[PDB]
Amino acid sequence: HRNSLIVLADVALFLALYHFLPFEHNVVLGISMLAFIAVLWLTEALHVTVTAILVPVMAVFFGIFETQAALNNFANSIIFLFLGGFALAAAMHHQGLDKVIADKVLAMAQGKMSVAVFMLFGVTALLSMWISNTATAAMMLPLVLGVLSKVDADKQRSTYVFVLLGVAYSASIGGIATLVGSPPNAIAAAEVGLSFTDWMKFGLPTAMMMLPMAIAILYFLLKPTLNGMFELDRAPVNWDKGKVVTLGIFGLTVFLWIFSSPINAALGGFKSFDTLVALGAILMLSFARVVHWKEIQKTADWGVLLLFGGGLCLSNVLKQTGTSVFLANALSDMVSHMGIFVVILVVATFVVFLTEFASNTASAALLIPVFATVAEAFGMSPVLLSVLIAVAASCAFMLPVATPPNAIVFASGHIKQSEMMRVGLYLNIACIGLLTAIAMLFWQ
Amino acid sequence: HRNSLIVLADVALFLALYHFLPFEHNVVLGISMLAFIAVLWLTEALHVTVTAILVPVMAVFFGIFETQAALNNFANSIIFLFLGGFALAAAMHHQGLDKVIADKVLAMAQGKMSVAVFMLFGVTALLSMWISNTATAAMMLPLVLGVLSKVDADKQRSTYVFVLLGVAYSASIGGIATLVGSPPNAIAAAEVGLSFTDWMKFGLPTAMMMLPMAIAILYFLLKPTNWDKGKVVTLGIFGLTVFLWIFSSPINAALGGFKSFDTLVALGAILMLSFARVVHWKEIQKTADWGVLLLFGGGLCLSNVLKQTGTSVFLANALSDMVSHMGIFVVILVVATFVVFLTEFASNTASAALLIPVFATVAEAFGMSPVLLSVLIAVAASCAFMLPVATPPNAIVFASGHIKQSEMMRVGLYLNIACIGLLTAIAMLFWQ
Ligand SMILES: O=C(O)/C=C/C(=O)O
Ligand code: NA
Ligand code: NA
Ligand code: NA
Ligand code: NA
């Protein structure tokens, strides 16, 4: 098979780099490993999580760490803060609080495709802030195909592709608003030690800008939906048992997540307060009987939770072997010749296009450690590159295979490959600007 | 709701013990917490895992530990050693290697009900060694009901309940052979730091003995009776994993002495199984019981809450005279007896999650090897044989809408007493 070969080709690459690199053994090991993992995660010949589990089992056998010390990465507070976000999402889906949020808002538009689709995007993004990205897409597709049936003429495609590609992007832009939403955010927060409200100060404003900037680009390429009528055909929804409760807990949780800084300070200064709140939410939702555990076990992506640990293990493997400082020495002249504009532009550009070929999180899982630790060897705060890398990681807008949401609206069997491949090629450039713009603004 | 009250009553209980107990404040906290958690886990007002997650958020807020230090319990090497067993199960089930293991064995009996039912038990136990207990029962139930169709006499119950209660017990007794099999076993290994081959030297002989003793009691009551793509690979990988797990002691030592070698072997299996393409991760993620994996961490955090607060030494001091008045026989007989019946009323693992920390840490304050009480407790925890709701395998063969509550309650009442003897018997021999 292909992937069995990519692994074999990668295994050879490691053995080659291992015996032939002419540096201090620690650097040779860290270099060989970083290459090995980079392939397995970008090619994905092996499952992201399988590669994640491979990270510790390597460091342990090659004397970098001891077994228990390596595994301890998989229990970082962010993992549980993310697992708390999973149970918080699983709750309002099994409860239907996502459905009622779509109807009550989508019915606010009386019957206009103009104010409908503009409401479909705002809801898809708002829902990605807390639930997910791949999950929010599948939940929206039937609601879009339902609306896009009055103008059911396929020969009227562009009226019916603008709404499909629009939500698939709003789900990705929504995941850039909060620490929960896309693993990349958690990978950055866990790498540089970000709080929920810390990452929101970065991503949310960026998403505020990217959503209009993204619709404008979608609008002014082939919008033909001004006229149209609504066919809300199905049983309406209605606030049932504790859908207000889930909203209350949710709102309460997000209130503590936002006001965690003063709440925690005016409480004794606990360590991972946001992680506790995420764990506290898991409790309230269970005491309030609103969600069973079987639900969370399905919704939770334990592979990403395992990936989180694998990514932190890598970050620590780069340091212990000095590969973080060795690469900073290697880039000394190169990076001194470059400006930080070129850097954040090269990085942003590199990822915003790199994420088109590989998984969103699999890209951050590899670059967030390298750039953060190398930025550290340079004595630079790994926050900027990490948040930057983590944000541009969720900027997959060209071909599918970049993000599941892309392949979700593509399986609708209507939007042409070429159609998507070129809207993202424009949006990618748009973000490289906005990001480098915002990345420059978020400086002083 | 019923359970919603237990929680409220338990919060009050904590406030009461907290405000009214007159001991060093730490003992009040550790005692209050131990009671709080003890209720939540035996009553199950909250899901086992919800209570487990409640442990760290408690210790963290009540200054016992720091958030990250508390959470670090959920990454113990035993947890990952068990996750390897899950991928090892998901592999050979998604491969179908468990069914073919039942067919190849079940057809070896030419056409005899006498040798038929006796073969259904041996496979349920063999499959519980590696797969699970609730899963081994549900996986066996269709295969068990299938045999009981030639002689389908309805009011021929005892001919048709001995085979149902036999597997429901063989699934629970089978899980006492290896560190993978039943969560209680893993809880002991994580508490006292046992290796895979260490726990097998203890449990496997006991499982060798308990299975016949269990069928004999059922017998002598009213008994009137293609190897495809890489199924050899799954079998190969599996065998390789178990070979390293057994010979891990010399293999690891003759390699540089890695720390949690069994955990490495367990994680290596997850890798071999994935490189060999024989099982996808979505399979491993489904078969894996992440709730139990989270529970493992919660139980270790409690154990550390008992020590950090001194409740282990306070209870060791409180039980000082009582245990000195008792022989070690009297102690392990009270203990063994205490659980073998407690496991009838509460979950198998929920019993070990609470008793293994308390007894192990107190036994340690006595300067005693906490292995015996811990391994003992973990074994007697899987001795639920009376009423249903003791173990899913019990409630699995019970949902057949045929086996009477009283019928099971008195065959198990015989097995329970039978086990209290066997356990205390072996527990006494395993001393010097
Ligand atoms: O291992 C199981 O399936 C169940 C264990 C228990 O409930 O004790
Ligand atoms: Na999201
Ligand atoms: Na991607
Ligand atoms: Na088992
Ligand atoms: Na039980």
TrEMBL record, chain A:
Binding residues for succinate 1: 133-134, 182, 359-361
PROSITE patterns the UniProt entry points to: NA_SULFATE
UniProt subcellular location: Membrane
Any one GO CC term of the record: plasma membrane
UniProt: fumarate binding residues: 133-134, 182, 360-361
Name recorded for this polypeptide: Transporter, NadC family
Organism of this sequence: Vibrio cholerae serotype O1 (strain ATCC 39315 / El Tor Inaba N16961)
Domain Citrate transporter-like: start-end pairs: 39-385
Residue positions binding (S)-malate 2: 133-134, 359, 361
Membrane-spanning parts: 3-21, 50-68, 74-93, 129-148, 160-182, 202-222, 242-259, 265-288, 300-318, 338-355, 362-381, 387-411, 423-443
Annotated NCBIfam families: dass (TIGR00785)
Molecular functions per Gene Ontology: identical protein binding; succinate transmembrane transporter activity; transmembrane transporter activity
Residue positions binding (S)-malate 1: 132-134, 361
InterPro entries in the record: Cit_transptr-like_dom, Na/sul_symport_CS, SLC13A/DASS
Topology of the protein relative to the lipid bilayer: Multi-pass membrane protein
Binding-site list for succinate 3: 133-134, 359-360
Main location: membrane
Signal peptide as annotated in the record: none
Any single GO BP term: transmembrane transport
Statement: the UniProt record of this protein carries the keyword GTP-binding: no
Keywords: Membrane, Transmembrane, Transmembrane helix, Transport
Binding site for succinate 2: 133-134, 182, 359-361
TrEMBL record, chain B:
TM annotation in the entry: 3-21, 50-68, 74-93, 129-148, 160-182, 202-222, 230-247, 253-276, 288-306, 326-343, 350-369, 375-399, 411-431
Residues binding succinate 2, per UniProt: 133-134, 182, 347-349
Binding-site positions, succinate 1: 133-134, 182, 347-349
Name of a matching Pfam family: CitMHS
Protein's cellular compartments: Membrane
One BP annotation, GO: transmembrane transport
Main location group: membrane
InterPro entries the record matches: Cit_transptr-like_dom (IPR004680), Na/sul_symport_CS (IPR031312), SLC13A/DASS (IPR001898)
Residues the record lists as binding fumarate: 133-134, 182, 348-349
Any GO MF annotation of the entry: succinate transmembrane transporter activity
Residues holding succinate 3: 133-134, 347-348
Membrane protein topology class: Multi-pass membrane protein
Record domain Citrate transporter-like: where: 39-373
Protein name, as recorded: Transporter, NadC family
Keywords: Membrane, Transmembrane, Transmembrane helix, Transport
GO CC entries: plasma membrane
